[PDB]
Ligand binder design. Sequence first.
Ligand SMILES: Nc1nc2c(ncn2[C@@H]2O[C@H](COP(=O)(O)OP(=O)(O)NP(=O)(O)O)[C@@H](O)[C@H]2O)c(=O)[nH]1
Ligand SMILES: [Mg+2]
Length: 316
Amino acid sequence: REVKLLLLGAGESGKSTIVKQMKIIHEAGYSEEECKQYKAVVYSNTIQSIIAIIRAMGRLKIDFGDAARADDARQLFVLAGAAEEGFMTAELAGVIKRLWKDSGVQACFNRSREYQLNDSAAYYLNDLDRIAQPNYIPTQQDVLRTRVKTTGIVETHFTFKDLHFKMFDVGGQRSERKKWIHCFEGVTAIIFCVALSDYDLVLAEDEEMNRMHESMKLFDSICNNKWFTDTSIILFLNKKDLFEEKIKKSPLTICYPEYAGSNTYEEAAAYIQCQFEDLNKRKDTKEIYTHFTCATDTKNVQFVFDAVTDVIIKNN
Ligand SMILES: Nc1nc2c(ncn2[C@@H]2O[C@H](COP(=O)(O)OP(=O)(O)NP(=O)(O)O)[C@@H](O)[C@H]2O)c(=O)[nH]1
Ligand SMILES: [Mg+2]
């Protein structure tokens, strides 16, 4: 009846978002009090995103589309402190809206692989009127879209198909990887997450290292670890939604110079799957259970998790 699941993968791969989904799917979702706890995270993420774009404009030498935005940028810093405390005035919202709508700001936003920016920047910025309303309470999707890097070990429990799951989540940033070993005992299954959309990005800790290459190294280490011979290895090729949009405009050759396929979702997605699955040194004795996911999409995760659960019931 007992099942231990361990979520692994590089930073920003979506591990913690999968954990949040278990609450929505298996429990009754986030309560009003719990949602309110995320209000300051949504506001902080929103302000940090617009600030990151404005910072990049200086570094890349991009001017504002309309000159009047310079004073809005000044007012952004004067007012930014409140959001961080869970407050969002109409004045601050207006400043952020005008900045977000500016052509120069948009030009910089569209060059985000050149700096570090939250995947949920557009999600919150495009929905400013809603999140800025007085008495705003985060929705389940707003909670799922929040971003806070994991430190330490998060343990979550839930019952599904008469099984009591004990799910462990850890940080994927370089500084937190030394902690993965504390979770290595009695693992029924490992869910290794990979952000498909990372193929053209670089690590925050190092701008010379391709994020997908880093992910591959980690997977090769985990999948081939003799300690995990009897542990089910589940591979979540995550952020499939972002990958579908990006493949249309950013060459996969940035990551795999030898890629000869077209810039289409199906071909490119299958190529990446093969690149990771080929790292398995024991293809005849060890199976990898791969699924393409969008961690923020509850219905997608529900069906994928139901499928993963059967594999676990049947094998472990
Ligand atoms: N659009 C989209 N965003 C996603 C998806 N999966 C996760 N995110 C977003 O990506 C950000 C990072 O996700 P998170 O779960 O925190 O990543 P992590 O692997 O736990 N990072 P760490 O290792 O640092 O704890 C969050 O803002 C989350 O909402 C996805 O499939 N699509
Ligand atoms: Mg996390």
